[PDB]
Design a protein around this ligand. Structure first.
Ligand code: MG
Ligand code: MG
Lengths: 325, 325
């Protein structure tokens, strides 16, 4: 396949796009919806089919003023773990900022009792909050399998470290519970990670050529949004921060001449040829945003192929232009 | 062209779909967005292109509690009148129901000072409310030109007539002011117009074969939602209700075996061949709505060709199935 085989932007008005190619021959898609009020799934046999795929709501936010999970439903990811579907997402009990001017999200998990994850809301049950030793702002969780274990990777505020959030990892006791104390892998520190907000968020994991590559997003969700990357040997101690190497420069960023601003909160999938790696990310096409960029709904989902360098590292290149007619 | 050339649903999660093919060949699209908080426009060179067309916000709702136009921005239509762009839309000052359990919408108009209607929000000016002699619930306004005059057609509640709204016509003094007293063209009365809720709304006008054909939607918005049609000779007194003929049966209804439930609030356009008439409407693929139905976002935009009967009347057929892969 080639980039031009896909009509971009693939999915309008969907941020934090997550695509999972399942064994049933379907691509499953989850993302943040503009009103941040529910979790819906789309499915199609092809990536282009997702642009017209009728969604199904499988979980709705709790009522206003009812406590946990009642506001700002962010970045759900659908995972298939030991034959069961799980969705990891973040939510807050309020839209109010705390005394540090931050969002009040925590991490949640829902589990499906059916082989079809899109049949009905009644098939999904809440496990509640995925707790961490320190109860602070946490979001954008993802999971990956390595060394016959399940790892959980997420973004969280540490009061002792400057900025909004750092990336952590921990091994899981089960799909909704941590077994180990969190380990910090990266914090915002370079100029490209600290524009408007000091942020490391949106982790995603790729496994290839004897290594795990963990991409993440940094800076605010406007034009400054960019992707960084950590690398680790697949057999190392994943819970030792010295096992991981951090890229000093972004691995993916704005392509300003073609009006692709702030690419980020990515995921990875495979094309319909079963071989080409695909980068899935959101991106904006203008910068004259009014108000908070999180409430402008025009982060659009993009998909494009990526390749591999001779040293076995990924080469993401740059955002491709829109090509709809 | 043929129905299979279009990937349906054309535009997911857009209700009250309005497509206008401009003299430069662009297809412009306006609709109610699921959060009902703004007016955005998409443009593409093809109807399928609209599925991936990056929207632009051209007008946003007024702040909460500030009065007119502050809530529930519904059903915008983009019209090109005497070389200027106008958008007719409905809005409320509140989300609360009136003492009769009804929505509190009134009709509004904005005008653009630029040839490009998607350049900037600063290009649009508010004309305010389009006032009617009785100040009651009103929405879904459309306009058409006939006999060198401009006619305004809309839906409005009459306290003396059972149901949520009837269809009215009036001649306009200018694009934001009525010249004549409203004339009622149809009220909900047939069995197929009064299922669960008594309503006539979403008017649309088609001109062909010496007649104007005014379609509208009736009944509740589940599988009972259906389209009616009025017919009048193109040279008749359009303000005399006795010039108009009401179809005693619906002209378009649910296609129950393929789960196309409740087609309505239509508009009309022309295909890329410049010849084939296209019906544009919203429709659901399920009716088992959970939570507040106002915020279930899955009314999807459908497009399909229609044809003409021997007597010069349109034949809409029935909803086509989804055909995305
Ligand atoms: Mg994620
Ligand atoms: Mg309309």
């Amino acid at each position: 396949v080639q980039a031009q085989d896909y009509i971009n932007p693939l999915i309008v008005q969907r941020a934090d796009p997550y695509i999972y190619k399942h064994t049933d021959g379907y691509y499953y898609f989850t993302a943040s919806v503009p009103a941040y009020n529910l979790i819906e799934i789309r499915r199609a046999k092809t990536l282009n089919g997702l642009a017209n795929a009728a969604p199904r709501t499988i979980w709705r936010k709790h009522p206003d003023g009812s406590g946990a999970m009642s506001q700002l439903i962010w970045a759900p990811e659908l995972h298939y773990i030991d034959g069961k579907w799980f969705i990891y997402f973040a939510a807050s009990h309020t839209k109010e900022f705390d005394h540090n001017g931050m969002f009040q999200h925590r991490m949640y998990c829902i589990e499906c009792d059916n082989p079809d994850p899109m049949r009905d809301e009644a098939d999904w049950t809440e496990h509640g909050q995925i707790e961490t030793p320190l109860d602070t702002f946490a979001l954008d969780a993802t999971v990956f399998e390595a060394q016959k274990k399940l790892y959980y990777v997420w973004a969280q505020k540490d009061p002792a470290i400057k900025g909004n959030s750092n990336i952590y990892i921990a091994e899981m006791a089960n799909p909704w519970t941590l077994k180990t104390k969190p380990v910090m892998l990266t914090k915002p520190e370079y100029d490209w990670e600290t524009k408007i907000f000091w942020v490391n968020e949106g982790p995603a994991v790729l496994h290839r050529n004897g290594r795990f590559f963990l991409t993440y997003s940094a800076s605010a969700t406007d034009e400054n949004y960019a992707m960084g990357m950590l690398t680790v040997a697949e057999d190392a101690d994943l819970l030792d921060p010295t096992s991981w190497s951090k890229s000093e420069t972004p691995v993916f960023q704005s392509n300003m001449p073609i009006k692709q601003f702030g690419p980020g909160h990515n995921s990875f999938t495979v094309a319909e040829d079963g071989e080409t790696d695909m980068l899935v990310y959101h991106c904006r096409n203008y910068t004259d945003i009014k108000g908070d960029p999180l409430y402008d709904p025009n982060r659009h989902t993009m998909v494009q192929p990526f390749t591999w360098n001779d040293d076995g590292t990924p080469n993401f290149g740059k955002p491709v232009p829109y090509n709809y007619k």
